[PDB]
Amino acid sequence: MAGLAQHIQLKYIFGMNNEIRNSLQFHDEDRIIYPAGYNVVLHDLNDKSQHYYQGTNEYRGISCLALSPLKRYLALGVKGQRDPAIIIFDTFTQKRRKNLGLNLGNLDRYNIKQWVSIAFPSQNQETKYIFSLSGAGGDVVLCWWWHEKGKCLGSIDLGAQNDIYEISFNHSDANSICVTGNNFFGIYAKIEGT
């Protein structure tokens, strides 16, 4: 099938979106990734050039963004009608790679409507695991073998009535993940595969 020619393609975005906590990050020493509307804009401080990571039309909005410690991957959580997803874009290529939550049949136990935070593991593990702290429908942190399987290897329940919004990996210990939220602070170390 011949793809329909794009009638119009975005050129520049006038404005910025700050509703995502920790949504402003340094992709490099000159490019900064920030949420703007439904497109994640990497803005260059020199030429003001904006590179727009665009999600699929099947989703509603953007909840949170995380960047791998090596800054090679950008994982964005998408708030959708029923199934939130995690879209990981390759900064080097600037192309969408894969999405988490598409096969959420096994995770239907969690009524996650959005991911409040995204955490990449250490630089030596960033490319093999990625964790998503879910909000507005259950604080669920899911271990995803995103690089190869893209499957949830484990589920961490942080409480049904916890306003949890931030998740990250311990710099000294990638086996440990720290999650912060309203009246919630957890630190989980994966021991013997759990």
């Binding site: 020619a5 794009q6 009638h7 119009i8 393609q9 975005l10 050129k11 520049y12 975005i13 006038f14 404005g15 910025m16 979106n17 703007a36 509307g37």
Partner: peptide
């Protein structure tokens, strides 16, 4: 309604 101005170049 987001306060952002959108410019899309028409490739047609």
């Amino acid at each position: 309604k987001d306060g952002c101005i959108m410019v899309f170049e028409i490739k047609d």
